[PDB]
Amino acid sequence: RRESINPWILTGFADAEGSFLLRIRNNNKSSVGYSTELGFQITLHNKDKSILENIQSTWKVGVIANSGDNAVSLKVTRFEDLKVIIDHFEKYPLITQKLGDYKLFKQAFSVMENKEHLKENGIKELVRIKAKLNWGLTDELKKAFPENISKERSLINKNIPNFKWLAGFTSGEGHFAVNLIKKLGVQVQLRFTITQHIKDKNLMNSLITYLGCGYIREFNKSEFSWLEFRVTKFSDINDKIIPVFQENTLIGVKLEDFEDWCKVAKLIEEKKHLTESGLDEIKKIKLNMNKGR
DNA sequence: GGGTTTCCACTTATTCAAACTTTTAG
DNA sequence: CCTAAAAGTTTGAATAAGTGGAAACC
Ligand SMILES: [Ca+2]
Ligand SMILES: [Ca+2]
Numbered sequence A: 001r002r003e004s005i006n007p008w009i010l011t012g013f014a015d016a017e018g019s020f021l022l023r024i025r026n027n028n029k030s031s032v033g034y035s036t037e038l039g040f041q042i043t044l045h046n047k048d049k050s051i052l053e054n055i056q057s058t059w060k061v062g063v064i065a066n067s068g069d070n071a072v073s074l075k076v077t078r079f080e081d082l083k084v085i086i087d088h089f090e091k092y093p094l095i096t097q098k099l100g101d102y103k104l105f106k107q108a109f110s111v112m113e114n115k116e117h118l119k120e121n122g123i124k125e126l127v128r129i130k131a132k133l134n135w136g137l138t139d140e141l142k143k144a145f146p147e148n149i150s151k152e153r154s155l156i157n158k159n160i161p162n163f164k165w166l167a168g169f170t171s172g173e174g175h176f177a178v179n180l181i182k183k184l185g186v187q188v189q190l191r192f193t194i195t196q197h198i199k200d201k202n203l204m205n206s207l208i209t210y211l212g213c214g215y216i217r218e219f220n221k222s223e224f225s226w227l228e229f230r231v232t233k234f235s236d237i238n239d240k241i242i243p244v245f246q247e248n249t250l251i252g253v254k255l256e257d258f259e260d261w262c263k264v265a266k267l268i269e270e271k272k273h274l275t276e277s278g279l280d281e282i283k284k285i286k287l288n289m290n291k292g293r
Numbered sequence B: 001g002g003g004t005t006t007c008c009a010c011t012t013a014t015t016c017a018a019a020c021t022t023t024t025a026g
Numbered sequence C: 001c002c003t004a005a006a007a008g009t010t011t012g013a014a015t016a017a018g019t020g021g022a023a024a025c026c
Helices: A007-017 A046-059 A079-091 A098-113 A120-130 A139-144 A163-173 A198-211 A234-247 A254-269 A276-287
Strands: A018-026 A034-045 A063-066 A071-076 A174-181 A187-197 A215-221 A224-231
Touching: A007 A018, A007 A034, A007 A046, A007 A079, A007 A163, A018 A098, A018 A120, A034 A046, A034 A079, A034 A098, A034 A120, A046 A063, A046 A071, A046 A079, A071 A079, A079 A098, A098 A120, A163 A174, A163 A187, A163 A234, A174 A254, A174 A276, A187 A198, A187 A234, A187 A254, A198 A215, A198 A224, A198 A234, A224 A234, A234 A254, A254 A276
Parallel strands: none
Antiparallel strands: A018 A034, A034 A071, A063 A071, A174 A187, A187 A224, A215 A224
C-alpha cells in the first residue's frame, strides 16, 4: 500500500494504462446460459507493482496478481467495489476515447445492479453494450444473439482538465530521452515525447497549445498509425516541461528517469555538456535510465 | 445446495515508449 | 565553423485487452 495517489493523477494514469472489461461467458450452469463479469484493470511491468499497490490503497478495492513472468495486474471486479470506480470517474472524468468505454461500463453496471443480467432481456442488453466496448463481440458471441447490433459510439472530444491529469497520463505515455548525437563527437539533445493512437489526435494536437511547445509527427508501422508529441528545444524543456512535472510529480519508475533527465538538464544549463568531464557524467547518467535502469 | 460471484493463472497483439541516425537552422 | 533544433528511422515489448479454470460465496 503506502503512498496514496492524487485522484486527477490517477485518472490521467487510467486514461493511459487503464482498461474496462465486460465478460459474457458461455455457462451451462447459468439459468440464462451465460455468466458475466464487470470491472476495470491495469497491467504493468513488474517494476511498477508499487503503482498498483498505491492505486489499491487509494481506492481500497481490487486484487493484485501476476500477469505472466514480467507483468502484474490490478483488477476490480467485485460488484460492490465497482461503485468506487464509478464514484471516482464521475468526480475525475476521463478525457480520451476510453471515456466511451467507461460510459458503457456504467450501462452494464446498471443492468447488473437491477439483477437483469440473470434474465434473457438483461443478457441481450449486455451483448449490445459489449458490442461497442473495446474490441467488441467475438464472432461466436455475435452469432449467438441474432439481431442488428450497432458497433458505433459517440467520439470523445475533451480537453486536458489540468496539469495533474497530464502528470498521470505522462506517467503512462511519457518518455524522457538523453539523445547522444554522434568536434567532441557528441551533441547532447534532451527529448521529451508522448505517444498515442491517432484516435485521439485532437487531444495530442492540444499538447502543443497546452504546453506552449513541441511538434506532432505521424508514425506508421504497417497498417498501424499513431502520433508522437516531441519537444527538443532546450529552453522549452527547461522552462515549460521540467517545471510542469516538478510541480506535478510523476509516479512509477519513470519518475527516476525524469529526475536523471533533470540532472542532465542542469548540466546543459551550465554548459558542462561541452566539457570532456561533463559529457562523461551525462553518458553515465544515460546508461542507468530507461531500459538501462 | 445450485446458481452466481470472485479470484487466479495465463495468453495475445499493438499501441506504445524507446533508441538511434541524418539533415537543417541560426 | 559551431552548436542547437528539427527531421528521420526502426522495433521490441509493456502495455491494453482478453480467455480458461475453478474456488468461493449467497
Ligand atoms: Ca494507452
Ligand atoms: Ca507506460
